[PDB]
């Protein structure tokens, strides 16, 4: 057989769901492209990884044509 | 007979005041013509976990 290979599962996906309490640092989404875009108080690292910029809670936003967004609405 | 301290362990590990086992960080002095300065810089000591229990046990003395 010429096959037999594969790579390590990269455990990608959302790490904090809407209405979850996070903290400045907490990475909120692990993804390949820009499947989710950084919203309010949400940074995104060189591997497109979204994280809380401040403490607070997590909320999602589907801006249709404009894509989907993860916001960290404060409370801190 | 008297137990023997493990010199391999003593040469590369330290037991802290609270009984933590603190070792250096692997992978920073051999192949770094360029790893990120963040990479080579993040080489202080760390703490081994639940298995320094074993390292501790070969230094005891």
């Amino acid at each position: 057989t010429r096959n037999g290979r594969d790579s390590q599962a990269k455990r990608l996906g959302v790490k904090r769901y809407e209405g979850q309490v996070v903290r400045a640092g907490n990475i909120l989404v692990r993804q390949r492209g820009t499947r989710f875009k950084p919203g309010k108080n949400v940074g995104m690292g060189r591997d497109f990884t979204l994280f809380a910029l401040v403490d607070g809670v997590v909320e999602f936003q589907d801006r249709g044509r404009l894509g989907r967004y993860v916001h960290v609405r404060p409370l801190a | 007979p008297k137990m023997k301290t493990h010199k391999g362990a003593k040469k590369r590990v330290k037991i802290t005041a609270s009984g933590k086992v603190v070792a250096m960080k692997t992978g920073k002095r051999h192949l770094n013509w360029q790893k990120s300065g963040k990479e080579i810089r993040q080489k202080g000591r760390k703490f081994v976990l639940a298995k320094p229990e074993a390292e501790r046990i070969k230094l005891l003395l």
Binding site: - | R12, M24, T26
Partner: protein
């Protein structure tokens, strides 16, 4: 033993300076005792007396350190901590040792 895999003998010694063949190098070892510790004494306090008390240990030279509060007594030692030299200069007097 980890079953054949390399163990955690895979970390690199830092404690560089492991010693060489003629051996350990003779040099004055200082042992620190705190102010709070000798607060029990009244009279003198010499590195000699402090062994009998059970604090000094015979192989080491005397160095009094900070933690604790000072007392108006004459304390004889080989070295004093910054914090300690001050703490007691406000009460008592203390000599430095270096004879024989």
């Amino acid at each position: 033993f980890e079953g054949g895999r390399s163990t955690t003998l895979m970390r690199l010694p830092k404690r560089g300076m492991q010693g060489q063949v003629p051996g350990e190098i003779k040099r004055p070892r200082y042992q620190g005792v705190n102010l709070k510790d000798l607060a029990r004494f009244e009279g003198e306090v010499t590195p000699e007396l402090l062994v009998r008390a059970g604090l000094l240990k015979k192989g080491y030279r005397l160095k009094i350190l900070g933690e604790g509060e000072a007392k108006p007594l004459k304390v004889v030692a080989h070295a004093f901590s910054k914090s300690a030299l001050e703490k007691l200069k406000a009460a008592g007097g203390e000599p430095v040792l270096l004879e024989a």
